[PDB]
Write a protein that binds this DNA or RNA. Structure first.
Lengths: 169, 159, 58, 222, 292
RNA sequence: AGCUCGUAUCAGUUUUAUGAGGUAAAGCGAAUGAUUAGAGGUUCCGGGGUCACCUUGACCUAUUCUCAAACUUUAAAUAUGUAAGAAGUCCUUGUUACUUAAUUGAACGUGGACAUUUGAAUGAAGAGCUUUUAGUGGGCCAUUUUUGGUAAGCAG
RNA sequence: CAUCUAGACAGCCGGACGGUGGCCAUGGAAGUCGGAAUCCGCUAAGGAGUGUGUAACAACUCACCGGCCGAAUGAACUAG
RNA sequence: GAGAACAGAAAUCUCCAGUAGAACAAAAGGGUAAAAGCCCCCUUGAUUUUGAUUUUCAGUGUGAAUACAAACCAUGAAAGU
RNA sequence: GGUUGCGGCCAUAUCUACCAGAAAGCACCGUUUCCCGUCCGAUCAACUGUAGUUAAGCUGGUAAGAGCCUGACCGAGUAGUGUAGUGGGUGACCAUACGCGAAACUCAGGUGCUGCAAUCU
């Protein structure tokens, strides 16, 4: 159809949410910089809940965002543990999709001592070439309704790549 | 305890007008005020610096001072049995040019032009305004306008 | 004990018996509150044009 | 404590004083039901509308509204059954009455300061009505006209002031006259909505008007 | 989605150019306003805008009915002066800033004085007022919605206008070569940016590296056979030609405005009036109900 | 007690032009806060009924009834500000240490043209200004608006 | 609003074949019934009657017309 | 609202809608959206000299505020504040 | 007449869907050595207008579109209100006289115009 209307990986964000901060968070930061090749940032907690052991601005989470071919190769190895198959669920109404795993230290990297075992949440943001018009400073417009990402075009993109299957339930 | 603060009873008069909130449109900051020009005060409530008192909203006075981001306006204020002149340092977004003066100015230009033409022809060219004079006699014909009769309507409850 | 606290009865009639007269402003009003850069220049302009008219009238 | 007579709060002497964030300790209304009878009936079932209309600018208390609601309902239910009428109490008691409670015992001058601190605590609710404002609207069939007339006449005795009973040329509770409602019902511009009807407008999306009023466009093609 | 009627009724739209996104009106208020004791003297704005493949510089003054233009300089007039490729770089921004400064100086008749700097060395220098003469023309840089970044092209045009004799007030913190550890500019790095050393050193490194990206980019350089050492020569030639003839020779304008209006009107959509709108809904009220 | 002048730099007034207001009214298929009734559309963020089951716990949409001194899109009447010229208008060119890129503007000017009416109506009964001092500084009633109060020849 | 010379509203004389007998809890379903309405063989006259009679006629006025009186009447309201 | 291992009403992330229904120390009201809100950066103008003006008003004080002049600074790239 | 830059009035300009766009221009797009800034060259900064594209932005058109604006002898001279009466009524309030005069509703039309400068089969 149109080469400017095909999907691509805008960004792919790995977020983890540790129950507290400290040594577990610093091991969580170094496993992500070994994962991504770039340093992550430590998300501070918004409030105090009384049930999760978190207080405000405690840095209870770590997230990092990869883009481009680094995001593409980490999604290939992110579906290798998810067996290149997924559900009709986990796809957002705006075309984005994400999935959670329970291990990365012995997934595709070498295990090293004193780092722990950490699961993580992959989340993938899908759009077309042309998403700058809602992100640039001068003339921050909208996106056209024939140019948005839906569930249907992104599961079709998930079919044409990875030779994947949907609705494993 | 009763209160008589600077902006007491200014809930509605220091609003912004409906769907006219936000920043002031930029013809206000580009209008030029000279000393002796007549302005009327309508305090834009979105800007708090240089805000006039609640008495001066809707008042009208001559500009005696023109300053960096503000003007100086002379307002007569009824204080008991006499008027006192009040000098207001107001930012230009709380004022606008009164159109009563410019209507007088175009009447002056019309009167000067009519006096210039009355030097040639039509002297006594009626410089003064006349009020709405009573109407002269007219003939009201009835072709196509036969007078339809009317009667009072009966009392109908209409409910 | 108690009395009348405040009443604006007869106050307008009192003000209008001698009339609420206008302040009766003059030509050349007071330059008190005008911009001091303008006022210093206005002094120097009138000092110049006084001598200019004196030299014009010799 | 015992309630004052209705002559204390008959006239609209005060500003309307609703239950709000400033007036919080207000007792609940003695009237709670405002649609009675077959309120689920269609508008075509009850063509006649009879209005009880105030002729005086006054206040109707919530107790007077509840007593008149009970008395009017009891007569019409006993006479022509339950599903032959729909009674609607138009006015609502939002105005809160205030009472300055005076002690009636001996030596009350020591414990009460008189008109010092005389602001009244909330007493009850009242419905502020104007001249020509409709109090009760009872719709029914054309057969049960004098039953509803006598039911609304028995409701006047519980009401202060002077009230008049008029039959309405409106088709039920609608704002349209009886001939105008007949034309729109015959042209298919009227859709039932349980208690009221939705009318077909000549403005709006034609796709939504086709989805909501298919009978009009079928009859236009006919 | 599916906004309520009450929301649309109460919705106060912003100003139209805020809705478009081209104007910061909070910024505009404190640029275009004037000291009220400077009664009818306009405040002149040097507006440098960056669309793709263009630098748009215009000296403009805000009035009641809109902004009038003194001198507007664009990128595509620089192929006349010699700059054939790279019409949106830092050096081209300096050239069009130099061009608009010389253009408005000759428009107001101050071309003989206020030469700025004939030879460029890359130092922060405000154009001083001459002794017993007219003051330099005071314009102010209105960068609009671009971000204030050290070593940006809007400060390239700011430097170019200041070097052209136009008095535009600024500091050297946003010029390239600005040290963040001391308050000292790098004049050699600024001069290299002025004459295109940030492109020529990229060209010689890419030529030493490979050929594929050196032919995908810079293909107009190979088309006109200009080299890395010739960038400074053609930019100095562009600077001398700008000083010599800033007189704004306009283009030819072939196939003129009546034909321009005619050809645009044939490929435009006309509006159906009340009669055509009533006819087309009468067609669709019968078509969507025609025994449907 | 006057003083300065002699029909005004005026007026408890209107008209015209131009504002300003947010009360009365009106409005809740307009926001906010209340409000009565039903109609139609669900995610495993419960079906309490046979695990995707007609199975009632919402929410949303479109209606509908009634309001609001401390709600409001709107919005009067009355009352209120200003102006309706000779201290003004137009043209030329003088000062500045102010301002301008400028022999640019601002302010103050110098010269010159400004009757049928010197620039709306009506009146002016003299206008303006200054001094000095007495008494008073408990009020009350009536129409209308209005607060507290059940009301008062009540209080405000 | 309903009748009215085809005879009205009053007044006075005459009036239920049996329809409650496979439709009635069969409370006292045969009088006029509290949980019911439609039946002609007549139906101006033959009524689950306007009428909890508390015992398959224990009771009169009345459902609606006749009779002949031969002119307007009745009902619901409204306000002086 | 839609989702994402632990993770559910509520821990962190992402996207969409969102005229402000948030926040602006504190009562209530007004005002504010590339902001007056949140985050980041730099500072001390919360400085000096006195004057004038507005409100309360006797057009007195006090308090608070407003616009400047002369400086000297802060910030910004500047206008400006 | 189209576009671009800066605008004036700040919805007749907004919003929700759908369609169209010749040439120019805008835009998406292409790449990170330097200035620059981030977790992330996504934003921003730089470089090339070169590999492409109208897909989107943008503009224009369509909707018995919602909204908004204008007008109406449309509601309605109605509600309200100034003045007046030794008017009425027990009062509540209403009526009249001389004026002024709405709002919701309903109907009809419309859906940006314009300034400066540049550019365009």
């Amino acid at each position: 159809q149109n080469p400017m209307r095909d999907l691509k990986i805008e960004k792919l964000v790995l977020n983890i949410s540790v129950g507290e901060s400290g040594d577990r968070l610093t091991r969580a930061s170094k496993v992500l910089e070994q994962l991504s090749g770039q340093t992550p940032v430590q998300s501070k907690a918004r409030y105090t809940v009384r049930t999760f052991g978190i207080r405000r601005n405690e840095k209870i989470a770590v997230h990092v965002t990869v883009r481009g071919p680094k995001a593409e190769e980490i999604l290939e190895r992110g579906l290798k543990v998810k067996e290149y198959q997924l559900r009709d669920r986990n796809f957002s109404a705006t075309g984005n999709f994400g999935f959670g795993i329970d291990e990365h230290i012995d997934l595709g990297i070498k295990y090293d001592p004193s780092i722990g075992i950490f699961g993580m949440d992959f989340y993938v943001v899908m759009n077309r070439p042309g998403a700058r018009v809602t992100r640039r400073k001068r003339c921050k417009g909208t996106v056209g309704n024939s140019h948005k990402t839906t569930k249907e075009d992104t599961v079709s993109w998930f079919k044409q790549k990875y030779d994947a299957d949907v609705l494993d339930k | 305890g009763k209160s008589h603060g600077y902006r007491s009873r200014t809930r509605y008069m220091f609003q912004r007008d409906f769907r006219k909130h936000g920043a002031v449109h930029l013809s206000t900051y580009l209008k030029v005020y000279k000393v002796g020009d007549i302005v009327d005060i309508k305090a834009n409530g979105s800007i708090q610096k240089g805000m006039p008192h609640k008495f001066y909203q809707g008042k009208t006075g001559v500009v005696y001072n023109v300053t960096k981001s503000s003007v100086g306006v002379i307002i007569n204020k009824m204080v008991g049995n006499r008027y006192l002149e009040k000098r207001l340092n107001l930012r230009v977004e709380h004022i606008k040019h009164s159109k009563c003066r410019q209507e007088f100015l175009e009447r002056v230009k019309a009167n000067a032009a009519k006096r210039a033409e009355a030097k040639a022809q039509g002297v006594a060219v009626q410089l003064k305004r006349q009020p709405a004079q009573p109407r002269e006699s007219r003939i009201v014909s009835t072709e196509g306008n036969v007078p339809q009769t009317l009667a009072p309507v009966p009392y109908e409850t209409f409910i | 004990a108690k009395s009348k606290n405040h009443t604006a009865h007869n106050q307008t009639r009192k003000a209008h018996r001698n009339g609420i007269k206008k302040p009766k402003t003059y030509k050349y009003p007071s330059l008190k509150g005008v911009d001091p850069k303008f006022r210093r220049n206005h002094k120097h302009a009138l000092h110049g044009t006084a001598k200019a008219l004196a030299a014009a009238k010799k | 404590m015992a309630r004052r007579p209705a002559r204390c709060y008959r006239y609209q002497k005060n500003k309307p004083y609703p239950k709000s964030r400033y007036n919080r300790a207000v007792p609940d209304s003695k009237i709670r039901i405002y649609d009675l009878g077959k309120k689920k009936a269609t508008v075509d079932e009850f063509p006649l509308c009879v209005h009880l209309v105030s002729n005086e600018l006054e206040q109707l208390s919530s107790e007077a509204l509840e007593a008149a609601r009970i008395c009017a309902n009891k007569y019409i239910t006993k006479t022509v059954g339950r599903d032959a009428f729909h009674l609607r109490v138009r006015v609502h008691p939002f105005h809160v009455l205030r009472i300055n409670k005076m002690l009636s015992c001996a030596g009350a001058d020591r414990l009460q300061q008189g008109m010092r601190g005389a602001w009244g605590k909330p007493h009850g609710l009242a419905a502020r009505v104007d001249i020509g404002q409709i109090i009760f609207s009872v719709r029914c069939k054309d057969v049960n006209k004098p039953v509803v007339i006598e039911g609304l006449r028995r409701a006047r005795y519980k009401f202060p002031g002077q009230q008049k009973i008029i039959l309405s040329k409106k088709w039920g509770f609608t704002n349209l006259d009886r001939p105008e409602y007949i034309k729109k019902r015959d042209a298919g511009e009227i859709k039932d909505d349980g208690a009221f009807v939705k009318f077909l407008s000549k403005k709006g999306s034609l796709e939504k008007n086709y989805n909501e009023f298919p009978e009009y466009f079928q009859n236009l093609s006919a | 989605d599916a906004k309520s009627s009450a929301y649309s009724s109460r919705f106060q739209t912003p100003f139209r150019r805020r809705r478009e996104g081209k104007t910061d009106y909070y910024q505009r208020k404190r640029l275009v306003t004037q000291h009220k004791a400077k009664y009818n003297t306009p405040k002149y704005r040097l507006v440098v805008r960056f669309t793709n493949k263009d630098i748009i510089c215009q000296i403009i003054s805000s009035t009641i009915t809109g902004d009038v233009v003194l001198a507007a300089a664009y990128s595509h007039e620089l192929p006349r002066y010699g700059i054939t490729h790279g019409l949106t770089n830092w050096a081209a921004a300096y050239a069009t800033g130099l061009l608009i400064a010389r253009r408005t100086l000759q428009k107001l008749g101050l071309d003989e004085t206020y030469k700025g700097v004939e030879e460029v060395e890359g130092e922060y220098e405000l154009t001083e007022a001459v002794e017993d003469g007219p003051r330099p023309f005071k314009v102010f840089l209105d960068i609009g919605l671009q971000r204030t970044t050290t070593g940006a092209r809007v400060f390239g045009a700011l430097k170019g206008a200041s070097d052209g004799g136009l008095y535009v007030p600024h500091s050297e913190n946003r010029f390239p070569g600005w040290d963040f550890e001391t308050e000292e500019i790098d004049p050699e790095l600024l001069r290299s940016y002025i004459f295109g050393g940030h492109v020529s050193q990229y060209m010689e490194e890419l030529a030493d590296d490979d050929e594929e990206r050196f032919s995908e980019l810079f293909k107009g350089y190979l088309a006109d056979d200009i080299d890395a050492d010739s960038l400074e020569d053609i930019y100095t030639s562009a600077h001398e030609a700008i000083r010599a003839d800033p007189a704004f020779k306009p283009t030819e304008k072939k196939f003129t405005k009546e034909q321009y209006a005619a050809e645009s009107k044939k490929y435009r959509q006309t509006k159906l009036s009340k009669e055509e709108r009533a006819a087309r809904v009468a067609a669709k009220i019968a078509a969507l109900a025609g025994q449907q």
